Amino acid sequence: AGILFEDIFDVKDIDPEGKKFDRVSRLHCESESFKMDLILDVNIQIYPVDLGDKFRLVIASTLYEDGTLDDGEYNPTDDRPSRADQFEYVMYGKVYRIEGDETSTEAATRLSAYVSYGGLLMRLQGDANNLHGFEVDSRVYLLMKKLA
Amino acid sequence: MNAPPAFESFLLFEGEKKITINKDTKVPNACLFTINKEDHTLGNIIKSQLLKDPQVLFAGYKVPHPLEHKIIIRVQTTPDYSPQEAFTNAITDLISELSLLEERFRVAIKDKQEG
C-alpha cells in the first residue's frame, strides 16, 4: 500500500494573476468526490497541461508501494522493487507546513497541506478526514497522469 | 618573472604520475582519478562517455585550479563493477569511437575529391 492520497482533479485555472516563471506554471485545481481544492506548480515544457484537463493525482510515501522506506536516494538501478511507473509525471518533495482551522477547544475540520517539491510548491485544502496522513518534514511523492 | 614556461600544460617532468587512483571512503564503490597535465579536452570526454554506462552511478570531472594543470574525475559504479574497470571501458570505447570516426571521415574525404 503506502498510499496517502488518491483523487482525480480538474484544472480550473493556469495563470490566475500572471506568469512569473517561463518553465513552471501553477495549476489551480478542483477535485471531484472529496471536493478537495488544489494548487500545484508543474513544469510546463517537460509536462504540458491545459485548462479543463482530467488528471489523476496520487500522494504516496514510497514509490514501491509494497510498504518499505525508500531511504530518499536516487539510483537508476532501482527497477527490481517494481516501482510504480503507471504515471506520466512524478515529483518528489517534503511537507513543510500543515495549516488548519482549529481554534483552541474545537478540532480542525479543514486542513491545508503544503509540500515543496525541491522548489515547486503545492497547497491542498480539504476536510481533515482524508488529509490526516500528511506529517510535517515527511517525504512525499507526487504522481500525475492525464485522463481522457 | 613568475610566468611558468609554456610546457607546463602537457609535459611531465620527473616525479608526477600521469594518472593517480584514490578510493573514496564516503560511499561504496567510488574512486577519484587525478590526471596530471591535462585539461577539459580529456575530462569532458571522460565524463560524457562514462555517463553512457548504465552501471555508472556517478561520473564527472573538474579542474581544481585553471592555473594548475590537473583533473579530478570521480566515478561511482554499482556493486560488483569496479570504477577502474568502468574507466578502462570508457577509454576503450573512446578509442573505438575515434578510430571509427577517423575511418569514416577519411572515406568521406576520399569520396569528396573526384566523386
Added chain:
Amino acid sequence: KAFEKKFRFDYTNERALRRTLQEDLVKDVLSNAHIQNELEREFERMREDREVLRVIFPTGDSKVVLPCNLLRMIWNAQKIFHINPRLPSDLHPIKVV
C-alpha cells in the same frame, strides 16, 4: 487584552489544555493549586517585566539587540526533535517555569 490572551496560561478552559498538553498533565495542572499559584506568580512577574520594558522603551520600539536568538533556537529545537505541532505536548509547564 491581547497580552493576557497570549501570556496568561488560562487553565480554566480544561478543553484547550487537553489539546495542547498531554492528557496526563492536564489533571495534574487542574488538581494541584500549587501549579496554578506558581503560574499566576510567573504571569505577575511577566507583567512587572512588561511595565519595566514600557519604562525602558518609550516609542514602542520592540527591535532590540540580545545575545542568543530565542525564536530561531526554539525553531531549531522543533526541527531537531521532530516536534509535531498537531499533537499535544508532554512538556509540563511547571517544569518550564
Added chain:
Amino acid sequence: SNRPVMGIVQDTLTAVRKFTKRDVFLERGEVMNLLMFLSTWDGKVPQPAILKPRPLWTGKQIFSLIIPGHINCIRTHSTHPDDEDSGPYKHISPGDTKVVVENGELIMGILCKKSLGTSAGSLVHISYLEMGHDITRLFYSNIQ
C-alpha cells in the same frame, strides 16, 4: 554592527538569484558536474525533484546540499511584495519570493543580497552563528 562583512557578491550573487528560481532544472550530467565542486558533499546524490518523464534536479534542491548541517532561516526576496503576507498565498508565494530554509534545506524562495549578502539575520549570518567559522568558510567557498 553584529553583521557579517563577507557575503556573496558580484557574479556569484546574480548567478545565485538566477539559479534559485523555480524554472531552473538541471539534467543528470550537470548535477554530477556541479556536485564535485561541493567540498562538504557526502557523495550521495539527492533524489531529483522530478523523476518522470525524465530526472530533473532543481536549483534549490542542489543548493540545499550547500547549506551546512541544519540551518533554519527565513528571509524575503527583493521583489517580495507586501500584499503576500496580508492576503492568501502567504506560504505559497506565487512569485516564489520570500525565503524559508528548514533543517538545512532551501524549502522555497529566491535568494539575493537580502539572504546571502551582508545584513543582520542573513542566511550566512545564521550559518556562522549556528555552525562556526570553519563550516561557514566552507559554505562560502562551496557557494562560490
Added chain:
Amino acid sequence: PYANQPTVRITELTDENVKFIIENTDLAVANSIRRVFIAEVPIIAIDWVQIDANSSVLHDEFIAHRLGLIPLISDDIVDKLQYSRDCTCEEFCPECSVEFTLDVRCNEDQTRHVTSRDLISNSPRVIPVTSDDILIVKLRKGQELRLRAYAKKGFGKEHAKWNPTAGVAFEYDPDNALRHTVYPKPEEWPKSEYSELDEDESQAPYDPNGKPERFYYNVESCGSLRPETIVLSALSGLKKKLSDLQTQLSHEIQSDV
C-alpha cells in the same frame, strides 16, 4: 555502455576551408574534437631565432615574433619530425628541426619589403606558404637584416604560433529545439545558415527527449596544414592521448593490485 556510431557528411572542401557535419555523437566528443583542432594538432613553426645583423627600425625580438607566426607548410613531414625535447641530439638536428636563413640588404633607394619569400629553408618540403607574400619588415636603403632560424614541431597548447587553423566554426542545433539558449525575443534573432525551418516561424518546437547531435563544423586552415589533414591529425592526436591515458591507467591498476 558502448559507442554510438558517428557518421560524417562533408559539404565543402577547398584548399583553405573544410565544412563537414558529424552526426550521432556526444556533445563533449564534438567539443573536444574542436578543441584539439586548435590545441593538440602538431605543426611546424619557427621557434629558435638568431639574428646576426638587424639595422631595421624594428627591434630584434619584434622580428623574431613576426617570424615565429609565419606558417610553414607542414602537410607531410610534421609526423616524421620529432619534438626537440624527445630528440636524442642536443640543440637541433635535421631529424628534429628545419633550418631557415634570411639575408636581405636594401641597396636601392626604393624601400624593400622583406617577405616570407626571403626565408630560405634547407628542406624543399617546408615552404612559408608560398607556392601573396607575408610581410616581415620594410627596409630603407642602407638597412640590413641577416638572421638564422630553426623551426620546431609544436602544437597550440604551447603557443598560438603552432595553431594550424583559423577561426574554427562549431555549431549544433541551429534551430533552437533543445533550448540550450533561450531567446527573450526569438523573432529578432537571425536564422543560422544550417536552419531547417521556414521563414514564417522563428524556432523549432521544444524537444524534451532530444540531445545535442549533428554538430556542424567549418574548419579554416592557416595554409600550414591542409584542412582535411588538420582533422585527420586532430583525430589521430586525440586517439594517441587517450591511448597513452589507457596505458598509464593500466599500469597504475596493475601496480595498485
Added chain:
Amino acid sequence: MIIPVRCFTCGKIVGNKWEAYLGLLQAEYTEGDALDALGLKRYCCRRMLLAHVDLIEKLLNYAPLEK
C-alpha cells in the same frame, strides 16, 4: 607599426594582405569592398586591416644609424 600577421582573434593570415588592401583602396574599391575581395569575412579579420596604421613608413623617413 607594421601590419601584424595572424589576426589576433582567430589567427587568419592578414600580414600578407596589407599591400593588396592599400592597392584596392587606391584604385577603385571602398574599404568594405576591398576587405571582401581580400576574403576577410569575419569582422575580427576586417578590423585587423581596417584599423591598422602603418607607422613603418614614418619610421623609414629617418636616416639609418649605419650607412
